[PDB]
Amino acid sequence: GPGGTMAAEEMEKIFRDKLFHLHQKLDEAGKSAEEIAKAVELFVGLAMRAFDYALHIAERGKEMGIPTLVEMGKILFKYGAKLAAELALAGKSEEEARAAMDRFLSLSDYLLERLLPYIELAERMKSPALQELVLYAFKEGMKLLAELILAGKSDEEIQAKLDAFLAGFDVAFEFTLDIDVIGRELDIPELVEFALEKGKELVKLALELARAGKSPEEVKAAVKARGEELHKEFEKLALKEYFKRRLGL
Amino acid sequence: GPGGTMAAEEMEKIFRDKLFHLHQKLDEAGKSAEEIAKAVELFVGLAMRAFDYALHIAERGKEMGIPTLVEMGKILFKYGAKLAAELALAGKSEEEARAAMDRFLSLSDYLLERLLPYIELAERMKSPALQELVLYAFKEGMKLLAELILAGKSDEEIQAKLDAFLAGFDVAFEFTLDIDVIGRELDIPELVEFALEKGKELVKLALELARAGKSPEEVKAAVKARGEELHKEFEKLALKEYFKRRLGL
Ligand SMILES: [Zn+2]
Numbered sequence: 001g002p003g004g005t006m007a008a009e010e011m012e013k014i015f016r017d018k019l020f021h022l023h024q025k026l027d028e029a030g031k032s033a034e035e036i037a038k039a040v041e042l043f044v045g046l047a048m049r050a051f052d053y054a055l056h057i058a059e060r061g062k063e064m065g066i067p068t069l070v071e072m073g074k075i076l077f078k079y080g081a082k083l084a085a086e087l088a089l090a091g092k093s094e095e096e097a098r099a100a101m102d103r104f105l106s107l108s109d110y111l112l113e114r115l116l117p118y119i120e121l122a123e124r125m126k127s128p129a130l131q132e133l134v135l136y137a138f139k140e141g142m143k144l145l146a147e148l149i150l151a152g153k154s155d156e157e158i159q160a161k162l163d164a165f166l167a168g169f170d171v172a173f174e175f176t177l178d179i180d181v182i183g184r185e186l187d188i189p190e191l192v193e194f195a196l197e198k199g200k201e202l203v204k205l206a207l208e209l210a211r212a213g214k215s216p217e218e219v220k221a222a223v224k225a226r227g228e229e230l231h232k233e234f235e236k237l238a239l240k241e242y243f244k245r246r247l248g249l
Numbered sequence: 250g251p252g253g254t255m256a257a258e259e260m261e262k263i264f265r266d267k268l269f270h271l272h273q274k275l276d277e278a279g280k281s282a283e284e285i286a287k288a289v290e291l292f293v294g295l296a297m298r299a300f301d302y303a304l305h306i307a308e309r310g311k312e313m314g315i316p317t318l319v320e321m322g323k324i325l326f327k328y329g330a331k332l333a334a335e336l337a338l339a340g341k342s343e344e345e346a347r348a349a350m351d352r353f354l355s356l357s358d359y360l361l362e363r364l365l366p367y368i369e370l371a372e373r374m375k376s377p378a379l380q381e382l383v384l385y386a387f388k389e390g391m392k393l394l395a396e397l398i399l400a401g402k403s404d405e406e407i408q409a410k411l412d413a414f415l416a417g418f419d420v421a422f423e424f425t426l427d428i429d430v431i432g433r434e435l436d437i438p439e440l441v442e443f444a445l446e447k448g449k450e451l452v453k454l455a456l457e458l459a460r461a462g463k464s465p466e467e468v469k470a471a472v473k474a475r476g477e478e479l480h481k482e483f484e485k486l487a488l489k490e491y492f493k494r495r496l497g498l
């Protein structure tokens with residue numbers, strides 16, 4: 001639109017894109033005109049609520065000193081619009097779609113509350129890598145939450161899976177922070193890149209374990225083992241880069 | 250004249266115009282004074298009945314919340330006055346002209362009852378394009394009905410033709426609604442204009458097929474094929490407009 005916010009324009013673009021591709025999918029599926037109209041109106045109804053909630057999150061982030069909350073609200077709206085598109089495409093009635101959207105928003109708030117301290121710690125140390133890791137973890141959690149809500153699961157199983165995912169993310173965050181501090185102090189960008197990449201890998205492993213139904217302890221143990229292997233790789237890379245710098249290479 | 254209502258003034262103007270041009274046509278044809286007088290009185294007698302019928306229909310529409318019924322009553326009066334003018338020009342006696350006017354009024358009521366649910370559905374979705382489509386369909390139906398009544402056809406062939414025309418109009422309405430919903434939700438007026446234009450084209454095709462004497466199934470099939478072609482054209486236009494909007498063009 002002509003007059004809006006820097007975060008509202010991106011969400012409007014996402015909404016238009018999702019609406020266009022939802023119409024494309026409905027046309028491909030070969031539905032009647034009234035069914036297409038019902039699906040479009042249902043999608044607009046759900047996406048309006050998702051837009052309101054994400055805009056509230058982004059505004060709350062803008063009021064305080066956390067630029068990460070704006071990006072995380074954008075991620076939330078993207079995945080809420082995605083969930084709304086699948087809800088409209090599946091032919092769910094209005095009541096079930098509204099209930100599913102409410103549960104999705106509540107569980108996204110749960111993940112928000114659990115992830116805020118990591119954002120504060122990352123922004124205290126001025127580490128872009130840690131902020132990117134938190135963004136990636138939120139994105140993966142949103143993916144898992146949307147898939148679980150689509151599959152029709154209870155609010156307790158989803159919370160347990162989120163708890164296991166956060167248990168894994170704690171270890172991933174510790175690994176990334178440990179590598180990134182020494183990478184920034186020694187002035188070697190390769191170490192920071194390695195930290196970010198291997199932290200993303202650890203977050204992916206934690207999410208995959210959480211989806212499989214493992215308890216938080218199992219996720220913690222497996223992520224710790226993978227982090228130990230990646231730490232050996234980091235030791236090798238750090239030695240190589242340090243001796244590249246030391247010899248003038 | 251003075252006073253009256255908003256809808257009766259336009260009907261009075263139509264009546265005066267038709268009377269004036271009927272007198273011009275009678276003078277051009279070179280008829281005797283008594284023949285001109287009898288044609289004029291016959292036309293006035295038929296047009297008064299048409300005026301009363303259309304005024305009722307318009308009043309019934311105004312009492313409810315359907316502005317479309319007023320416009321369709323005006324359309325009915327216009328074509329009833331046209332039929333009366335042709336009947337007076339042909340020199341038919343009062344009995345045959347009165348019977349023909351009666352049959353025309355009954356068949357216009359038949360078409361009105363068949364078209365009412367589409368008006369209700371269009372008003373429920375608040376779609377000006379669908380209301381315009383219904384108005385156009387009623388206008389074409391009145392044209393065909395006047396032509397058939399002038400041609401001297403029974404009250405069975407006319408009903409069969411009307412059913413075929415309505416069978417085509419169902420597909421035309423579905424196509425127009427399908428395009429119009431997505432055009433309105435994405436806020437692209439070109440899509441709504443395309444919907445209206447191609448729905449009018451489909452209605453014209455359905456009327457042409459009904460005039461030729463085809464069964465409703467053949468009309469349905471042909472209108473469906475033409476709608477598929479127009480749907481491919483709509484897909485092209487929608488992609489072009491969406492990429493114009495997305496790129497800021
Ligand atoms: Zn709000």
Ligand SMILES: [Zn+2]
Pocket residue numbers: 178179
């Ligand atoms: Zn370390």
Ligand SMILES: [Zn+2]
Pocket residue numbers: 301
């Ligand atoms: Zn009367």
Ligand SMILES: [Zn+2]
Pocket residue numbers: 027427428
């Ligand atoms: Zn379509």
